Amino acid sequence: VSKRLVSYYMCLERLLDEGVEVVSSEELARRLDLKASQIRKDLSYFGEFGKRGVGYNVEHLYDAIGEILGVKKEWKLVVVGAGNIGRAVANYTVMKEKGFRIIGIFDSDPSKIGKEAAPGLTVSDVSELEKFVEEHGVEIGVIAVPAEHAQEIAERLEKAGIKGILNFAPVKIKVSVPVENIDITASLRVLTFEIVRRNS
Amino acid sequence: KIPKPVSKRLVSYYMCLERLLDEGVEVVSSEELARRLDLKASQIRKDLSYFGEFGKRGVGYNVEHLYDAIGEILGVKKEWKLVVVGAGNIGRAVANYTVMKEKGFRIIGIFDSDPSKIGKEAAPGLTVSDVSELEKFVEEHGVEIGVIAVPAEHAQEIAERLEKAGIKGILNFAPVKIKVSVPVENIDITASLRVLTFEIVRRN
Ligand SMILES: NC(=O)c1ccc[n+]([C@@H]2O[C@H](COP(=O)([O-])OP(=O)(O)OC[C@H]3O[C@@H](n4cnc5c(N)ncnc54)[C@H](O)[C@@H]3O)[C@@H](O)[C@H]2O)c1
Ligand SMILES: NC(=O)c1ccc[n+]([C@@H]2O[C@H](COP(=O)([O-])OP(=O)(O)OC[C@H]3O[C@@H](n4cnc5c(N)ncnc54)[C@H](O)[C@@H]3O)[C@@H](O)[C@H]2O)c1
């Protein structure tokens, strides 16, 4: 699955950066916090091409999963909201190195429009969001606006032809395009549930 | 006699009860929960009997009572103490997140190794502390959750220090797998972008 494929990809990529050639299912099981039977079952999708002896060829799986995930493609991004989240994301320098290029950032606050959210990036007026998205063919919109305005902002991106939405606002966006939510509070909540379970 | 429902199904009830409240449902039946949670109606009644009559209203279950009683069991009414390690883009944005205290999470300290950042305000009322005192601060204040907002190359090191200081859990923003004896929730923005783009291409 997508989340599981990405999890394998991040692990194997760190493994290649270290320089490791072969990784065992048990090392994968520990690194991914998964069962060794599931590690072998998931990776059996790549057949004997993904294995070297008892272990797994790190570069083969990394290249094969990178192909599935389409990691060679670059993506145009816009960030709606020049607040805490929007600026932190816009200033993540290596994001462009991973193939995700933020080319526009928008906000409805006159004090911040015209300011520099990041080197080479100027906050634009959210009134020009649809025009900017259609003109530049932006594929992914990053919603860093409040939860009340999130559905509206999402509708604006969808009407303007956005292909996907990365949503930081704590609300279930109702829209046709794929949405990936980063809910920091919910992630903290999920963590607490596991904390309560272990200390019960 | 009536056993406490396991955490995994408590969480399932909680999220289902949350959706019901958003829909405006005040009373829900065992069969509706059986349908929405894919469980035996018999099992729904055995699980919810843990909350006695307090969980029930009329012909069904009191959604509000169950949401708050299950949330209480899951620590939703408990104000969790957080520290943030790393006072950069992520750490400052998390430290500046206004209403997180209202949601139940209070950052009482933020730490960094940069002497140019230490002693400045990461957020109004919050001073960047020297990461040298990280363990002592966590132990003294009984900090539960550590938010790792440092670069990946130092993330494992920070996690072990939090672990040694008795941290209960870790929210990790650094794109690495953390190996510690406490639970870890990863938030990987790049991974989330990769999931999103894969689903975009999948629809074609
Ligand atoms: N910062 C966190 O750690 C955190 C945690 C959990 C959730 N979130 C969610 O992430 C989102 C962003 O939070 P933040 O901390 O960056 O908020 P923030 O207040 O710092 O920034 C929000 C920005 O959105 C802008 N904005 C508001 N309405 C707009 C509109 N219609 N069009 C364009 N811009 C608009 C505001 O001017 C502001 O600059 C929020 O929805 C928040 O609930 C953030
Ligand atoms: N900003 C994003 O959008 C984004 C996206 C994906 C991942 N991340 C990950 O989140 C983490 C933080 O990102 P950021 O953009 O805030 O980075 P940043 O460089 O802005 O913050 C790093 C901070 O950590 C501090 N630090 C470094 N080593 C430390 C140590 N041993 N102890 C304490 N503090 C230390 C630095 O002084 C710096 O202030 C990184 O791991 C990054 O890869 C961030």
Swiss-Prot record, chain B:
InterPro entries: CoA-bd, NAD(P)-bd_dom_sf, Rex_DNA-bd_C_dom, Tscrpt_rep_Rex, WH-like_DNA-bd_sf, WH_DNA-bd_sf. NAD(+) binds at residues 86-91. The keyword Transcription regulation applies. The keyword Nucleotide-binding does not apply. GO terms for molecular function: DNA binding; DNA-binding transcription factor activity. It is found in: Cytoplasm. Keywords: Cytoplasm, DNA-binding, NAD, Repressor, Transcription, Transcription regulation. GO terms for cellular component: cytoplasm. GO terms for biological process: negative regulation of DNA-templated transcription; response to redox state. Residues 12-51 bind DNA. Homodimer. Modulates transcription in response to changes in cellular NADH/NAD(+) redox state. Belongs to the transcriptional regulatory Rex family. This is Redox-sensing transcriptional repressor Rex 1. It comes from Thermotoga maritima (strain ATCC 43589 / DSM 3109 / JCM 10099 / NBRC 100826 / MSB8). The lineage of its organism: Bacteria, Thermotogati, Thermotogota, Thermotogae, Thermotogales.
